[PDB]
C-alpha cells in the first residue's frame, strides 16, 4: 500500500509542498508513487505496512535549493528526512522513522570541492561516495588514503554523521571531521570553526575555531542539514602489512580481549581491532548450504569442518601494521608475543594464505582504504536476506567480551539465526557487535527478528551496555535506555530541537528526538 | 572603585541572592569586599576601573550546591561567572567580562573520582589541579602520564574547557575529554555520552554515547556549569627522548615550517611541536638587564650575544620522541634529516646541554607531563610584569609563518615591547602565538598594550587569521571576526543560549555570547 500522510498534514498541504519542491529542483527531481520504492528500507522489519514509509523524495542540486526546500517544508509543516546518499542499509536505508516524511536526498550534490595532499584533507558535498573520492585521488596520483566502511557506495559525509567507522588508523570517521556548512531548520546557512571567518584558509585545518564547539550537534541529529563537510585524510604510509590471527576455541575470546586491551590503549595496534566469529568470516566466501543441509543454525561438527576448509578459527582477529619496516616489525613483535602462548593460535600474513579467495586478502583491501561491494555476499549465508546489527559499548575486558558472546549467541540461535558476531575496539571501547541476517520477505522471520532485537537491547541495557548507532525502528527504544536522571539528556536535546527547529520539520524521531509538536 | 552592580539588578536582589548563597554553601564561602581581590584580573589591561569587576564570589563544595546557586541566580537575575580553579592568567584570571557578575568558584570541588590505569583515564571535579592529579598518580605508582599546560596549578577541567594545550601526544586537552556532568542554566543536571546510561562502566571509554554529540557545546561556553569530566591519560611509554633543534636566522622559520608540515601531518612528530623565539626561551633563565640596559626592545647585536651565551637560536624547536628505541630512532632519522642541511642548525638532546638551569631540561619535564611553575620566569624579563597572548591560527606554511612573524614582531617592537613568539603546531594547524609582557601597574603601558592588541587582531583578520582563545577584554572583538554570512554562527550560538539560559544568568559575554536580555 501507499504511504499515509504525516499526521497534522492535509492532502492539500502535501500536494502544494510537493509542487513547490518541484519548482525548486525541477519536476524530474521529485519522486512520488512508484518512484518512491528505492527510498524504502530494503531490509524490511515491520509487518505493519503503515510504518517507516517515505511519502516522497526531493533531490536538490545545490545548497541554495536545500535552503528553499527547507523554507517550503516550514511553510507547509511537511517533515523532511535528510540523507547524503541514503545508503544506510542495516539502519533503514533512506527510510524515515515517521511515515509521511519526505526524503531530502542530497546525492546529486557531489562536488569534490578540495582534496589537499600537503595538508591531508578533503572538503566534500554529501553526494560524494567513497568510490568517487577514491577514484579522484588515484586519477590525480595524490599520496593519500581514504578510510572506508566495509562497503564503498555510501557517503563520506553521511556515514561520518551517523558515527560510522572504517578499518585504517582514521577509522573513527566523525573524529576526522573538520569544518562543516549547515542549513539550519529555518533555511539560513552557517559554517563552523574557521569557516566562520571570511577569507580563512584554515576551515579544514583546525576543528574548534572559537567559542562553543558545535559540529558534534549535527551528527546523529535532526538539528540541521549538512551541505559541506571537511575530513582529514591519512598520508600514504611508508609501509603496510595486513595480518590475521585465528583462535580455535570460542572461549579464547576472554583471554584474547585481555591481551588486546593494553595494545589498543597504548596504540600498538594502529587501526580498529576486529575479532570476527567463524560464520561471519565464513559467509564472505561460502554459504551454509555448502556445509549443512539443516534448516537451522550450524552444529559444532560443521563449525570444525568449516574451520579446516577455510583456515579460520572460531575467532578471527584482523589488523594491520602501517609505517616504515622497523616500526612495523617492533609493533608486530609486541602483538604476536601477546597471543603466542594461546593453545591453537595461528598467525598469517597474506603470503601465508593458501586460498586465492580468502578472508585476509579481502580485509587487507579495506584496511588500506579500498572501496568495494563484495561484503554484501555475506547476506547469502542462509539463502539470501537483509541484515541489522546491535553494537553496544562495553569495557575492553575478557569478562565483558565472553558474557556478551554467551548472552547473544544463545539468543540469536534460539530464534534460528546463525551467530555472526564481532568484538571491535576503537581506542578504549569494546563493542560486541551482533549481526543478524534474515529473510526480509518472510513476515514470520521479520516477527522473530523484531522480538529478538528487543530482547538483546533490554538484556544489554540491564548490564549497562548501551548502543551508539541503530536502525530507524529502534531509535526511540535506544534513546530510552539513556535514562539517567529521568531522561535529563533527551530533555536537553528536545530543548535544543525546539529552539533550532520550532516547526519540527527535520527528521522527526531521529535519535529519538521529536520536537514539541509531535511529543 | 568598588565593583558596581550588574545593569538591571537591584541592590536588594543582590543582597537576597548573596544571603541565599550563604545558606547554600555556608557564610565562610561567600566572599565580598576585601576577599574579592584574588578574583580580579591579576594582569590588568583596562585603565577604566569600572570594568571586569566581580561583585562577589561563592565557593561550593558539591554539585547539589552548584544546582542550588544556579536556581537562586535565576530567581534574582544575578549573573554567575563559572571557573574550575580560576587560574586563567593572560586571559583574565577568574574575572568576568561583565562587572557585577558573581564568580562561581569550584576550587573546593577537588575530588579525584577515579584514576583507571588499565584503561588510561581519570574522572575529576573542576578543582583538581595538575599538581594534585600528578601527585595522586605518583603516590599510587600508576603507570600513567598527564599532559600539563606548562603551569601546574591550573585545572584539568577548566583548561580543557577553554581549549587549552600541553606538550605530549595528549596535548589537545579537549580532544582527550570523554564524558562530563553539567549543571544546565535552569539548575538541572545532565551526563553526556555513556554517562547517560544507568549502570554504565563506559563513561570515560567512549565519547559519543548516542544521538547528538554535545560535550563540545560546553567548551568556551556559557551554556552550562561542568561539575565532572573524564579525560584520557597516556600509558607510560617504553621510552622517552626530548630534543631541541636551534636555528640561528630569523628568516629560517619559513623553511623550518615547510619541513614541519609533512612530519606533523603524518604524525612523525608525536607531540606538540613548539618553535620558540629567542627572547621567550632566554627569559626562562635570564633577564634583559643581563645583556642590555636600554628601556626599549633588544637590538640585533644583543640577540647574538644571547644566542652564544645560552646555546639558543633565533628559533628553538623543542619536541620529543616516545616509545621503544627502534621507533624513536626511526622517527629521529626522519626529523634530523629534515633539518640537517639548514646552515647554522644545531641539534641537542639533554646530555648535550651545558647549562644546569636550561631550556631543554625544563621543556623535557613539560613534554613528559610534569607540572611546574617555571614558565612564569619569562615575566621577569623586564623587571616584572603580567602578560597577554595573541594566538591566531594559520596553515603550516613557511609563507604563513614568516608573514605572521614579520607582521607581529614589527608591531610589538614598535609599541616598545620585546617580541616573544611560540609557533606551536597541533596536527594540521599553525598557532603562531605572540606573548606580550608588560607592566600591569602602569596606566601608560596598559593603554599602549590595548592599542597594540586591537591592531594585531584587525591585521590578522584582514589576512584570514582568527584567534581561538582570548582574554575577557577581547572576547566580543574576537567573536566579531567570525562574521561569515552576517554573523550567522553567533546568531545560532545566541539561539542556543536563549533556549538553555532564557534569564541569561551564566557568564554573560563569554566568547561574545550575551543572551536576549543583554544584547
Ligand atoms: C554488509 C554491510 C556492511 C556495512 N559495513 C559498515 C561499516 O563497515 N561501517 C559503517 O560505518 N557502516 C557500515 N554499514 C552500514 C551502512 O550501510 C553504511 O554506514 C553506509 O555507508 C551508510 O549510508 P550512507 O553513507 O549513504 O549515509 P546516509 O544514508 O546518507 O546517512 C545516514 C544517516 O545520517 C543522517 N544524515 C546523512 N546525511 C546527513 C546530512 N547531510 N545532514 C543531516 N543528517 C544527515 C541521516 O540520519 C541519515 O539517515 C554496513 C552495512 C552493510 C549492510
Ligand atoms: C605563563 C603562562 C603560561 C601558560 N601556558 C599555558 C599553556 O602552556 N597551555 C594552556 O592551555 N594555557 C596556558 N596558559 C593559560 C592559563 O594560565 C592556563 O591554561 C590555565 O590552566 C587556565 O586556568 P584554569 O586551568 O584555572 O581554568 P579556569 O580559569 O578555571 O577556566 C577558564 C575558563 O573556562 C570556563 N570554565 C572553567 N571551568 C568551567 C566549568 N566548570 N563550567 C563551565 N565553564 C568553565 C570559564 O569561562 C573560565 O573562565 C598560560 C598562562 C600563563 C600566564
Author numbering:
A (entry chain B), B (entry chain A): 1 to 519
What do the authors report?
Pro151 was substituted with isoleucine and valine to mimic the N5 environment of EUGHs. We found that P151V and P151I can operate with oxygen although they are 10- to 40-fold less efficient compared to using 2,6-dichlorophenolindophenol as co-substrate. The crystal structures of the six P151 mutants were also solved. They are closely similar to the wild-type regarding the substrate-binding residues whereas loop 150-153 locally undergoes localized rearrangements, with each mutant adopting a distinct conformation. In general, the oxidase-active variants (P151L, P151G, P151I, P151V) all adopt the trans conformation that slightly shifts the amino acid at position 151 away from the flavin. The analysis revealed a consistent pattern: in the oxidase mutants, the 150-153 loop conformations create tunnels that lead to the flavin re side.
